[PDB]
Amino acid sequence: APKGTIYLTFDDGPINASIDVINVLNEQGVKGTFYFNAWHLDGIGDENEDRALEALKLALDTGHVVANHSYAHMVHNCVDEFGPTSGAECNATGDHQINAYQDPVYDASTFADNLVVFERYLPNINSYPNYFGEELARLPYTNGWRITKDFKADGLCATSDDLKPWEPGYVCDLDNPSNSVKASIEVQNILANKGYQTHGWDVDWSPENWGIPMPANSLTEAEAFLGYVDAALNSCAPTTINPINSKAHGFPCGTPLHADKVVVLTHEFLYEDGKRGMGATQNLPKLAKFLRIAKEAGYVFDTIDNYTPVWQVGNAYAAGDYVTHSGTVYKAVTAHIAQQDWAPSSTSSLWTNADPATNWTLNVSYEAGDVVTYQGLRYLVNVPHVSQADWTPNTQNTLFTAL
């Protein structure tokens, strides 16, 4: 038996430093989840990205999961007209989390255009089992969560309308949050309706002190960081974390799917000797040590696509157990042994659809007070039922009422 499961996640690649992080993981057989922005493939990301596409292939060919972090990390929302140099301009002012989300519908279509750009550089990318770019996402700067119908969170302080949190006068206020944070929540609901899950994080391997001249140099030591991981296990880390920017407000603490797991967040550019410090010189052995000793401490590493386990012939499932089957979440209705001829489906009596989306869907267990969207209209659930073809919201005056 294992102590728990760590999910190593790496934001904001593929950059030339993705290559070196991958080789450290590959030396120890650990596989990681990589949330990628494809503008590094167009070389407009203002980093070292000569080998970005080489990095993307190395990740896929050595079995790491690739996931959708949007095309340009919402840098169009920081400049006034997004173009080649926008990545460089926005690094001058450092106004990244300021007005990070504005038009939710445009911002969300940035995840769509991400996929179009990947498939253009790696035209055979859909043939990799590891490519989850259509199904797994993470919002820039936001500790947001869309996991199941009953497992969602939101980062209510992750972005700002005016000031940075280290500037005098920054007041957060979860009761009326920033228009940027409001926009970020709409983006998640849009992605959820497209069939995505989104994962935030339990722990952040990041600078303890971003203000420092070389902020990559202040990365937590591995031994100490194993301490933050042991700290975070079953302790509902996303609400207790610091700063209040990276908090996941509304995290369903105690939820069963999160038990015995820790999602670690890091950035590849923290592992590069360069503009942010001695990243490779100081932190690549940090990461190597963390794998050796976290294994010793009793952990097993995995990738986010298994956080929600895949339905498997031969496993015993209990009522209320969550699985994934074709990138769609289901909750067991009936304890049973899963056999090949009754996998989850839109008509299974053994399973109900539990995707965190909000359009009306077949085989969902609706509670009263739920709202669904159907043929462009919003209906409210008057009576708890499991939906089926005959009960479309626009024909069942009893079950649904139009808003």
Ligand X SMILES: CC(=O)N[C@@H]1[C@@H](O)[C@H](O[C@@H]2O[C@H](CO)[C@@H](O[C@@H]3O[C@H](CO)[C@@H](O)[C@H](O)[C@H]3NC(C)=O)[C@H](O)[C@H]2N)[C@@H](CO)O[C@H]1O
Q: Is 11 in the site for Zn ion (CB under 5 A)?
A: yes
d(C-alpha 71, C-alpha 346), whole Å: 32
Q: Which of 4, 8, 12, 229 binds ligand X (CB under 6 A)?
A: 12
Task: List the one residue out of 152, 143, 290, 201 whose CA is nearest residue 7.
Answer: 201
Q: Is 135 annotated as contributing to ligand binding?
A: yes
DSSP for residue 311: P
- Find where tokens 């990390």 sit: 73
**Residues 291/299, Cβ–Cβ less than 8 Å:** no
Q: Is 195 annotated as contributing to ligand binding?
A: yes
Q: Which of 99, 180, 246, 303 binds ligand X (CB under 6 A)?
A: 246
Nearer to ligand X, 246 or 324 (CB): 246
Interactions with ligand X, residue window 80-139 (CB under 6 A): 87, 91, 96-97
d(C-alpha 257, C-alpha 352), whole Å: 16
* CB 401 to ligand X: min, Å: 41
**Residues 177/156, Cβ–Cβ less than 8 Å:** yes
Q: Is 154 in the site for ligand X (CB under 6 A)?
A: no
- Contacted entry of ligand X, Zn ion, none for residue 206, CB cut-off 5 to 8 Å set by kind: ligand X
- Contacted entry of Zn ion, ligand X, none for residue 355, CB cut-off 5 to 8 Å set by kind: none
**Residues 9/32, Cβ–Cβ less than 8 Å:** yes
- Contacted entry of ligand X, Zn ion, none for residue 165, CB cut-off 5 to 8 Å set by kind: ligand X
* CB 15 to ligand X: min, Å: 8
* CB 218 to ligand X: min, Å: 11
* CB 90 to ligand X: min, Å: 6
- Phi then psi for residue 167, to 5 deg, are -100, 145
- In the chain, what are the helix, strand and coil shares in percent, each to the nearest 5? 30, 20, 50
328 burial (CB, 10 Å; 0-12 / 13-18 / 19+) is buried
Task: List the one residue out of 184, 63, 211 whose CA is nearest residue 131.
Answer: 63
* CB 182 to ligand X: min, Å: 18
**Which region among 113-121, 242-250, 284-292, 329-337 touches ligand X (by CB under 6 A)?**
242-250
Residue facing Zn ion at closest CB distance: 11
Beta strands in 254-295 (DSSP E): 261-267, 273-274, 277-278
Q: Is 165 in the site for ligand X (CB under 6 A)?
A: yes
User: What is the pattern of x (binds Zn ion, CB under 5 A) and - over residues 275-304?
Assistant: ------------------------------
